[PDB]
Design an enzyme around this catalytic site. Structure first.
Site, PDB file in Angstrom:
ATOM      1  N   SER A 104       0.863  -1.172   0.000  1.00  0.00           N
ATOM      2  CA  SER A 104       0.000   0.000   0.000  1.00  0.00           C
ATOM      3  C   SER A 104       0.902   1.224   0.000  1.00  0.00           C
ATOM      4  O   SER A 104       1.618   1.461   0.968  1.00  0.00           O
ATOM      5  CB  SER A 104      -0.885   0.003   1.246  1.00  0.00           C
ATOM      6  OG  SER A 104      -1.659  -1.188   1.322  1.00  0.00           O
ATOM      7  N   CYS A 121      -7.358  -0.597   7.361  1.00  0.00           N
ATOM      8  CA  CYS A 121      -6.218  -1.174   6.670  1.00  0.00           C
ATOM      9  C   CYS A 121      -5.395  -2.077   7.577  1.00  0.00           C
ATOM     10  O   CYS A 121      -5.227  -1.792   8.759  1.00  0.00           O
ATOM     11  CB  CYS A 121      -5.335  -0.044   6.125  1.00  0.00           C
ATOM     12  SG  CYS A 121      -3.868  -0.608   5.258  1.00  0.00           S
ATOM     13  N   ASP A 150      -8.560  -2.112   2.986  1.00  0.00           N
ATOM     14  CA  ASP A 150      -7.274  -2.385   2.366  1.00  0.00           C
ATOM     15  C   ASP A 150      -6.637  -3.351   3.346  1.00  0.00           C
ATOM     16  O   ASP A 150      -5.710  -3.006   4.082  1.00  0.00           O
ATOM     17  CB  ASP A 150      -6.432  -1.113   2.227  1.00  0.00           C
ATOM     18  CG  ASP A 150      -5.091  -1.369   1.545  1.00  0.00           C
ATOM     19  OD1 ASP A 150      -4.945  -2.411   0.868  1.00  0.00           O
ATOM     20  OD2 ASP A 150      -4.183  -0.522   1.674  1.00  0.00           O
ATOM     21  N   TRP A 209      -5.169  -7.453   4.175  1.00  0.00           N
ATOM     22  CA  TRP A 209      -4.504  -8.572   3.536  1.00  0.00           C
ATOM     23  C   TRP A 209      -4.020  -9.604   4.536  1.00  0.00           C
ATOM     24  O   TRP A 209      -4.099  -9.399   5.751  1.00  0.00           O
ATOM     25  CB  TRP A 209      -3.318  -8.060   2.711  1.00  0.00           C
ATOM     26  CG  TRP A 209      -2.249  -7.405   3.544  1.00  0.00           C
ATOM     27  CD1 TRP A 209      -1.231  -8.027   4.215  1.00  0.00           C
ATOM     28  CD2 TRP A 209      -2.113  -6.004   3.823  1.00  0.00           C
ATOM     29  NE1 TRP A 209      -0.472  -7.102   4.892  1.00  0.00           N
ATOM     30  CE2 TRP A 209      -0.990  -5.854   4.670  1.00  0.00           C
ATOM     31  CE3 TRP A 209      -2.828  -4.862   3.436  1.00  0.00           C
ATOM     32  CZ2 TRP A 209      -0.566  -4.605   5.140  1.00  0.00           C
ATOM     33  CZ3 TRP A 209      -2.404  -3.618   3.904  1.00  0.00           C
ATOM     34  CH2 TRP A 209      -1.281  -3.504   4.748  1.00  0.00           C
TER      35      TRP A 209
END
Ligand SMILES: Cc1cc2nc3c(=O)[nH]c(=O)nc-3n(C[C@H](O)[C@H](O)[C@H](O)COP(=O)(O)OP(=O)(O)OC[C@H]3O[C@@H](n4cnc5c(N)ncnc54)[C@H](O)[C@@H]3O)c2cc1C
Ligand SMILES: Cc1cc2nc3c(=O)[nH]c(=O)nc-3n(C[C@H](O)[C@H](O)[C@H](O)COP(=O)(O)O)c2cc1C
Ligand SMILES: Nc1ncnc2c1ncn2[C@@H]1O[C@H](CO)[C@@H](O)[C@H]1OP(=O)(O)O
Length: 609
Positions: free
Chosen positions: A393, A561, A606, A608
């Protein structure tokens, strides 16, 4: 784009005697690999298949598939953010939604690749399976729902084991190692024609010409690489890549992808244990002269180059790879273990799951622990998956740093049950890049994670650990907007780390932004500074009254995120509770309210890993 489409895939099947085509919607290569396995499987049932990227074709030609006797189409489709198709499947997805074509006579099956830790689990696979039927085609086998949060390889094995018998029974058909490529060693090769790690055209790394993308990465200079964390428990780093003169554009919220190089010691050991000369120049040429995939990776090239830049040599090998390698294990017990790794049940499956997957044994580990396994280097190179780019990112704002793309990552290094220390490919490689020239092949992937269009709109950012990444860009930008004399709404950051003196990333920079007013609030949860855990959601709950005000009356945008497995879900749940208390409304309605924020672009993710 738009890419120029190949000629009808049906006519190609007719000319090559194929009756089954398997399309793959893929981004990281998993679905592409599954499609290739199914295509290859066709041969063992008296049929002939081909795998294909849907983006290269006009799927409207499916209406002609019935022209081939006992024809069938299979779709191996993965899902991305917000239940969207993979980039290579966007054309197909839009066609399905718009088209009205009649697919009477078409026989299909779908295997979806997803992950249950997401809202829209296997949304693409589900959509394709549903739409084809609505258009008039007939399902030959149940939709497959693979979950990468448990074990996708096994979901595929189970589905595939039932799929083929179903096909054989329907079409009335019935059920030896075969190679897709042939080895051609080059003895008098001109160094100018040998690939050395570039991804697209030969010498594209040395001779750079825009536009730069996934096929033509820009080699960005590493201008800075510094340790972000104070302590030594882990290694967190900040890198700055020079994209000057690349003409690459980007915005805060976008992702930067990099093509790393594998550990040279690991590469050397593989060649060493196999007794192979890694500096031999060669090519692996498709035995199917009609296919457009001439090589498994850029050729000609040396095995050393292939193992270093083109092949994945660190992730646990998939069952088909071990299955094919078994023939090269001279110890019966070892050949047997490798053979049974592809089992859909029993001890063979249990061993694969524990000894290969859980222990995280990469190819070299397996070659070392099953010493009788000594495959020829060329066949191994044909079996290994492609080395994928890694995404980060972007941690900078193009309003402040138009010619630099910043990255914030934690270096991966852990103890595996296999008994060895495994190193993350991209992060170990990035960690070793020293300014002054260290180059990083990269490209930018546009995302939908973005600051509000209106500077006055409130912003609530939740990004513990490396989840702070995009927010450093967000804050730089909001700071810039104020400096430019614009009216900026509240900007709140909910960050978290273990201890203020261990891994408080960008501590100094954040302190500055806070002091200058760029950050209306700097809420930090130090999870390990007390006996109980203090996480970002605990701070959100603390500020529930104000957050509800910003959300319900201020039109605030929420951003989350970082860790997708636990943090994102815990944070989502806290927002549910906040809405339920202040709506007021029952949990069920609070959930719909929050999910609506997501559809309306006011709750972005965002997350992961
Ligand atoms: C969209 C997106 C944004 C991202 N943004 C960032 C970012 O900004 N910063 C950042 O740091 N990362 C981010 N990543 C993650 C990043 O892309 C890489 O996955 C990460 O840096 C590791 O890559 P690597 O090549 O170093 O490790 P790899 O060689 O790819 O190894 C990764 C694998 O190691 C295994 N593993 C790691 N720890 C253990 C363990 N302890 N026990 C067992 N297995 C383990 C897991 O299978 C993990 O998937 C992002 C990922 C995505 C998809
Ligand atoms: C950025 C990102 C977003 C994802 N979004 C979803 C999603 O919305 N739904 C889902 O079921 N799986 C989602 N996944 C999981 C993938 O669908 C799954 O890992 C699939 O195996 C990847 O296949 P590929 O390697 O062929 O692209 C996501 C993975 C990444 C990396
Ligand atoms: N479930 C979760 N929700 C919010 N934060 C979490 C979390 N799990 C771990 N964290 C915290 O996220 C930060 C970055 O990893 C750390 O402070 C970590 O704390 P912990 O490691 O002490 O549990």
């Amino acid at each position: 784009a738009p890419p120029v489409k190949e000629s009808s895939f049906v006519e190609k099947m007719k000319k090559t005697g194929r009756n089954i085509i398997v399309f793959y919607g893929s981004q990281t290569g998993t679905a592409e690999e599954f499609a290739n396995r199914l295509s290859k499987d066709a041969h063992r049932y008296g049929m002939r298949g081909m795998s294909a990227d849907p983006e290269e074709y006009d799927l409207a030609d499916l209406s002609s598939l019935p022209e081939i006797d006992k024809s069938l189409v299979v779709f191996c489709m993965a899902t991305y953010g917000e239940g969207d198709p993979t980039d290579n499947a966007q054309d197909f997805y839009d066609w399905l939604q718009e088209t009205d074509v009649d697919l009477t006579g078409v026989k299909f099956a779908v295997f979806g690749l997803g992950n249950k830790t997401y809202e829209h689990f296997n949304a693409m696979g589900k959509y394709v399976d549903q739409r084809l039927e609505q258009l008039g085609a007939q399902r030959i086998f149940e939709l497959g729902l693979g979950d990468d949060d448990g074990n996708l390889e096994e979901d595929f094995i189970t589905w595939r084991e039932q799929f083929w018998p179903a096909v054989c029974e329907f079409f009335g058909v019935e059920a030896s190692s075969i190679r897709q490529y042939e080895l051609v060693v080059h003895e008098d090769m001109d160094v100018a024609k040998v690939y050395t790690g570039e991804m697209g055209r030969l010498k594209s790394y040395e001779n750079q010409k825009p536009p730069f993308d996934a096929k033509n990465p820009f080699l960005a200079a590493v201008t800075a690489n510094r340790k972000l964390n104070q302590g030594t428990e882990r290694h967190l780093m900040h890198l700055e890549l020079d994209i000057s003169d690349s003409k690459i554009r980007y915005e805060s919220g976008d992702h930067v992808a990099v093509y790393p190089a594998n550990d040279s010691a690991l590469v050397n050991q593989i060649g060493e244990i196999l007794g192979a000369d890694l500096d031999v120049i060669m090519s692996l040429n498709n035995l199917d002269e009609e296919s457009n995939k001439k090589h498994p990776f850029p050729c000609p090239t040396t095995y050393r180059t292939a193992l270093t830049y083109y092949l994945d040599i660190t992730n646990p090998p998939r069952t088909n790879v071990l299955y094919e390698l078994a023939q090269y294990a001279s110890e019966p017990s070892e050949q047997e273990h490798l053979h049974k790794m592809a089992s859909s049940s029993g001890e063979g499956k249990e061993l694969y799951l524990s000894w290969v997957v859980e222990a995280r044994r990469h190819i070299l580990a397996i070659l070392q622990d099953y010493p009788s396994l000594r495959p020829p280097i060329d066949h191994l190179c044909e079996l290994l998956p492609r080395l994928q780019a890694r995404y980060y990112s972007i941690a900078s704002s193009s309003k402040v740093h138009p010619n630099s793309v910043h990255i914030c990552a934690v270096a991966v290094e852990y103890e595996a049950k296999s008994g060895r220390v495994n190193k993350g490919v991209a992060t170990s490689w990035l960690r070793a890049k020293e300014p002054a020239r260290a180059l990083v092949p990269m490209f930018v992937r546009k995302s939908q994670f973005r600051l509000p269009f209106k500077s006055t709109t409130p912003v609530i950012m939740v990004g513990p650990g490396t989840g702070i990444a995009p927010f450093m860009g967000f804050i730089q930008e909001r700071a810039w907007l104020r400096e430019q004399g614009k009216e900026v709404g509240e900007t709140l950051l909910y960050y978290g780390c273990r201890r203020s003196d261990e891994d408080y990333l960008y501590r100094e920079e954040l302190a500055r932004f806070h002091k200058d007013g760029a950050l209306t609030q700097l809420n930090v949860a130090f999870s390990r500074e007390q006996a109980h855990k203090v996480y970002v959601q605990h701070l959100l709950k603390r500020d529930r009254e104000h957050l509800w005000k910003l959300i319900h009356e201020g039109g605030a945008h929420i951003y989350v995120c970082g860790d997708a497995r636990n943090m994102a879900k815990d944070v989502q749940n806290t927002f549910y509770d906040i809405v339920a208390e202040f709506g007021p409304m029952e949990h069920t309605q609070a959930v719909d309210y929050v999910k609506k924020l997501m559809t309306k672009g006011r709750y972005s993710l965002d997350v992961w890993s």
